[model samples]
Target: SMSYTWTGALITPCAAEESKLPINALSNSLLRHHNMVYATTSRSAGLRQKKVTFDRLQVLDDHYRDVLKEMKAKASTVKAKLLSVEEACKLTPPHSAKSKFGYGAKDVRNLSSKAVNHIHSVWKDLLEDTVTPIDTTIMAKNEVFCVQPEKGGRKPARLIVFPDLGVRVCEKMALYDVVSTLPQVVMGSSYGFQYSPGQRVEFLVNTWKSKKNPMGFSYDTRCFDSTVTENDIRVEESIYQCCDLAPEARQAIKSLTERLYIGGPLTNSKGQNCGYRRCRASGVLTTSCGNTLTCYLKASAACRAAKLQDCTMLVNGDDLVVICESAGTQEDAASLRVFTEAMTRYSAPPGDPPQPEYDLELITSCSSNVSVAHDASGKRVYYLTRDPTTPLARAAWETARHTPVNSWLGNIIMYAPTLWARMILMTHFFSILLAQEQLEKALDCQIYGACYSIEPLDLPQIIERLHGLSAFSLHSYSPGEINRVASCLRKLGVPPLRAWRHRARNVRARLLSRGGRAAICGKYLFNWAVKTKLKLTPIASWFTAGYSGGDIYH
Candidate 1:
């Protein structure tokens, strides 16, 4: 079946979309090559549609069924509940799209009678009608990034297909518990969202070392959402059904599966009929869970078909990394070919063909890789890091414009221990905040899809709590990591690290002079800037959480 069938209508934007990078005073301070940074807008959505729309072929074998059976057995151990209207409403993000039916996210969050009453009707509709295809808004997501020269410079906008806000809230009511709890329970350590940056690096490191001769590779599926077949979505629903859910929850799940999950009508922002879709919708309550399960199931089966020995997989959505005992270099390459063949048969073909890598640092998954650095005590420590190109580009944009999500803050929190993040991202952003005197301002950033209002002053403590005291003192980065950072800096025309160090000293001194939490930020976060470091200690009382795909707000 075709992934999509289009009318001649266009996918329109609700407001003026900015395609070029907005340049301001602060923009030049972070990145000099402003032309290299651009945001995707609705204009290129047609190109994206062409790329994503294709026929999907899936052939599930005994290996796939075997993995499914094992997964179902673990999933059966879980009991999930249906969320009440109030509960689901509270989970909605403040800036989530307004419903065509009237009322907005604020009204839903406050449990207004209009929102509540409408939500009840939506839920009732879901329970009563199991075959009606739901309507979803298809829009181009305007995300910022540095251009990759190898990828033909500027890339097209990615399409996000989501149902209306009322239905979105109802999705939460039906499957919030199942999506949040099921993947971690069933997939165990392989579920990538469950691990923090540090824990993820640790898992990868341990997994790599456990093998006598480790061979690892990351599998990249070509348009993973488009590759999802109706059978795949149904398989996902059956897995969710394996959970011990409330009767209403089960009915709602089944109905949503038949109605919304498998496929829907694609309406543009102007409410024009753009197309009909049978592929996975990028924005939905069960997207992450379904993608994770389907990706894992197919990969596991592929691994079995290839007869790969002692395979350890760490899956986060469509990003998959497998570390297994190598059967020599020649055989390892051959086995990967068989694995790719199996995955291709399962309808999840590779964007770039998978290659067997013997080096742990060479295998990048979730846009991060394990790299070595030294703590203050001269002991080698492993941490996760990635190319700073996109992070830096987005940071430059956020510094100049008032974007809804403060990704710099989230990057600082998640990649706090990385040399590039601590040195460039923290120094640059904190200096801006200090100059603007907005340290007290609580800006919203997401950590694992959940939005958080984080204060600039609280970063030292947050960094300590999330990454630990070692994050502050990590130095002596590996050469491979240093070269990547240096190359990225050159490509993005970012100021050299030496210049950032000079600026960081000034930021650190001023922060210390401010006293209180700002002083802690100066001493702890900027210690790497100085010749001598401050004594670091553990911070008290900080909790961690995740609410990806749940539209969670804090």
Candidate 2:
């Protein structure tokens, strides 16, 4: 009976003060408002009917076939791999991610109860209904602006897409591992999110090494989901077709494409008929696999046509990072123009016409910038990061729900050594986990549709994977990043970073004194003074992608 609410305002907060602990942080933030699903459907709830239908509207052509043929050929080069049902089940997000079928993540992952029955029913519906595309709910997310809010409060309304539960599971059946494993298989290092912060920076650095002059920058697409043409959606389907899949999986793929993937109906908050959507929805199974592949196809082809040498990509859905040889100031300028044109021509136009923040060392992707700061150990560490606003917003959400993916955890892994993340996120999460008695429960969370698990004690080992011995060290943050973080925390109603650090230090000592998973957390998280370092088991090929669902509004 749980369903979503919709929003278009860009400046509204989830709640205000007088909201108690756990509730204060949980209220008034984007994640607080956006992630909640309740039982009541106000006239504004516009929850899509589960019985919605979808038609095969995509008309494919030569260009689509060509792209598909190439992607299939490339995917063919790599042997087909599928996750075992158990493996796939592991990726089912914690119950809080929302269950299309009233069954929480527990039912889905346990593969028990009526989950299988519901899934089969979903499959049956897909086979039966082929005309009415499922309807996706939308919301305009608000956040603390690096700049002031303006223009009907120019608070950028990030378009969100949420699909039906049955469709979501079927999507997992067909596309879960495709998102996690297929991109790297087809796009190699160009598959963006697969790599760690260290690998990303290394890729950029290595790509630029031989260039006399190097140019690197990132691009964002305007309404990237909306820009996904019907053809683009079909092209993604064609790529999915390339894989060797179980029959049911294949059937699910087709059914989903026709009913949900190619396009769907969208209803607004007030149950008013919003409209139809023919593009990729951000919340479906294909959101990751579809967008990454499409972006790669467009960017790769664009790079080829533009004749940009040593062009390397790091794509995270609609966000992009491009590093290639710079032809010099003048030629680089011209190439940039050509690059923009190529991207536009390929269906991914520049996003929102925001002015590019030029940088040479590294460029923006995922709204993150490459910056340097000193760790507690005094080493100047380079890490990719953006404003801590989103992380801060979701930190409150972490107080409850216990979902697998949250912004703070993702940033903790990605920006482990950064001052704010190392000091605040790691400490706060572990500190809270210790109190909740869940710190050492064999860490599990959703990542790119696949379930991944890790050990609490594996932090040092995992951190070392990205950089040599430097991953978990604490960084002294810019007073500026700190100032903004503090302001956002105050405005957002979360505790200040200092309080987290202070509490973490105390918690760190207690966890060590207790000496168990708690102690293990302390050793790795507050690792400065440990004498007997436990070189625990390395993370198996099995888990620890270290991040998922970092998007605050999601």
Candidate 3:
């Protein structure tokens, strides 16, 4: 069946949208060639629509059923509670979309009588009507990135389909507990969201070492959400149903699955009829859990079809990495073809054909790979890192424009062990924040799907907590990682590493000039900039789960 059935309505922007980077005094300091950085707007939605829309064909076999049964058995061990109206209301982000029914996120957060009453009624409606098609708002997401001329000069904006604020609150009421608890239980160590950055790298490294002759590959499903079938959604619901849930919760989950999850009416921002979506809605409570489960299920079955030995998978939503024992180069390559064919049959085809990689560092999953670096003790350490191109590009744009999410902050936290993150991102952003004296101001950024209000001054503690003392003192990066960062710097017109080093020295000094937390930041985060580094120590952390696409805010 077709992923989407469209009306003539266009995806329109609510306000003026900027397609190119808006140059500022600081923009030139970070990126010399402004043309390389661009933001995707609603204008390119047509191209995105074309790329994502396709008829899906599914052929599930005993392997898939066997995996499903295993997942259900694991799921049955858990007891999940349905969130109350007040609890669900509190989960709504302050900036979440306003309800068409006379209330907004603020009202919802405050547990306003009107919002509470509407939520109750919405929950009631969900229980009563299992077959009514729910309405969802479809909009193009405007995101910043660097231009890759090889692929295309600029890519189109991705569309996000989501339910209204009222329905969303109801969704949380129905499935919040299930999503938070289920994936980790069923997927176990393979649940990628359960690990912090350090833990993830450790898991990948350990998994690679455990294999007799390691061969790994990342599976990239072309428009994973669009490939989801009604049967797939129902299969996901069955897994959820295996959980020991309350009667109301069970009924609500069933209704939401039948109504909203399987298919929905798409309405544009202008309240005009846009289309109907018969695919997984990108913006939903269950998206992360559902995608992870479905991707893992398909990939696991594909592994069996390929007859790959000792296949261990790490899945975070649509992003997947499978590391298994190799059966010689010729056989590994042939098995991957069978793997792709099996995945295609399951309605999840690869955007890029999967190729067996002998080296762990070369295999990128979730846009990141394991890279070698030297800790302070001169011991080789493996840490998670990615190409600095997009992060730097987005940082440049964020420097010029005040966006809701400060991705640079998130990148610094997630990739703290990386040289690019420690040397460039931290130096550049902290300098700007220090100049503006906003280091103490909390900026919102997401880790996985949950939003965090992080203060720049507290980064030293944060990095230590998340990545350990090694993150602050990591040096002697691998040649491949260094070369990638250097190439990315040149391509994006970012200042060379030497220039960033000089900037870091100055930023380090300025941070030291400010006492207390700022001084702590300089001493720990910028210790790498100095000839003699400070003795780094330890700290604490939180939320070891991934909730991407879950619309969670903390």
Candidate 4:
């Protein structure tokens, strides 16, 4: 397993080096291989555990064969297309203003746009041939259940995919017309899709409203339930618009029609109207002027009202699938086919591995059972619940419930420790808030550190050490006072040699003395203050002490 994991890391260099390839091609190849390897390894392990008669050796052989077949097919098609596209791109005279060879923002934007256009052309071609004809049924499966139309409505069922989910939830408002004096009006009804465990969702939009279209979509995939706020949206919009190419790019991509349909913006909704702000702020809007000049509109209220009537067909879990299609020339279609083949070949298996039997047993024993006693009215119910008390069982239960949430929150918290550490290293001064920030930043940095060899020391331990020292008797001193302490300590440790090598050694010694004193003070505080407050064991208290003694100037 470790060997395979190491091999996976080694394979990344290939993609990194070939970053000029279309993103779809790169992502599909990497993902497909990853999926194949992981799925085969997992299934073989499962069969071994079940004591089934299946041969692990044979399973691996089949898996590898399948992988190779898929890769070969994709590679052949991609190779042919790559040569033609590269030649075509090279033949076109380079426009100095749009060329991205240099590293300026305009250059990057132009480069990105060109790449996107090329990939889009390729994907469009792929869809023309290989994409199964849009079956409303398949597309309907991926739709948000709550937003579907009523059973007998005259309107046909429509599947709308937004760039992000939050776009569907917010009400669209038109900007105010200063000349006409009419207040901007809310143009669309707001809808919400509350997610539950095990629900799968996808987005759809009218094919005409895609990236290639003039009128753009306004949806925010970057912001979510946490972090972003209404106020932040304004701030982000201001920052985005100020970018050099944003205005022209947005103008080129803005949507042309006011079609009342479910979906999001596609073009340059980068500024104040971008969905990112709404997502970060988590605030709801109530009213607006009816001018379309500035405000982006969503699907009309009539459409949403029609959707609210249907319930059963929308929530049927097993029947849902999302289909997206495009029209492109033969060359584009061929490229897409190659890309899709790569994706299919490398896609990971459908499910994660089953938890170990021992883990299951522990979880089962510790897990809570709930019973509801309802009165004849069916409205009043009394709840009974079981408590998880045994240590192992409790631990397992907590792990099962909190693992995913913590994994996500961990990413956010991690920022603190890293920022704090950087500040400390740069400034050599600390405050409680600063310490907390450092701790947050450290936690963030350490997550990456766990999988890589180049990472620095354990951030959490360093944070705890700093935290432990928070209650110490060390008085807050001026910069001059701290510098004097550092200077006197350096003088005491300076070596009696003038050589550069000797001076380097002397510098290290002085640093050691300062560090040693800080560590000792931190250790003393942890033992005497923190542990005592918590009534922890002396051994545990000692471990919290940050000191690791060595001779200064050694």
TM-score of every model versus the real structure:
0.98, 0.72, 0.98, 0.17
Give lDDT per model, in order. Answer: 0.89, 0.57, 0.89, 0.20
TM-score, candidate 3, is 0.98
What is candidate 1's lDDT per residue for 86-127, written digit by digit as tens?
A: 898988888988889889999999999999999999999999
Q: In terms of lDDT, which candidate is stronger, 1 or 4?
A: 1
Off by over 4 Å in 2: 1-69, 78-91, 94-114, 124-132, 135-159, 245-251, 267-273, 352-362, 372-381, 396-406, 427-468, 473-508, 527-554
Q: Indicate whether candidate 2 or candidate 4 has the larger lDDT.
A: 2
- Tell me each candidate's RMSD, in Å, in order: 1.5, 7.5, 1.2, 26.7
* Candidate 3 per-residue C-alpha lDDT over 218-318 given as tens digits, one digit per residue, 9 for 90 to 100: 99999999999989999999999999999999999999999999988999889999888999999989999899999999999899999999999999999
lDDT of 4 by residue, 494-524 (tens): 1111222232333323332444333332333
Candidate 1 clashing pairs, residues 3+ apart or interchain: none
lDDT of 1 at 58: 80
Ranking of all candidate structures by their lDDT, best first: 3, 1, 2, 4
Backbone clash total, candidate 3: 0
Query: Model 4 — TM-score against the truth?
Result: 0.17
Q: Backbone clash tally for model 1?
A: 0
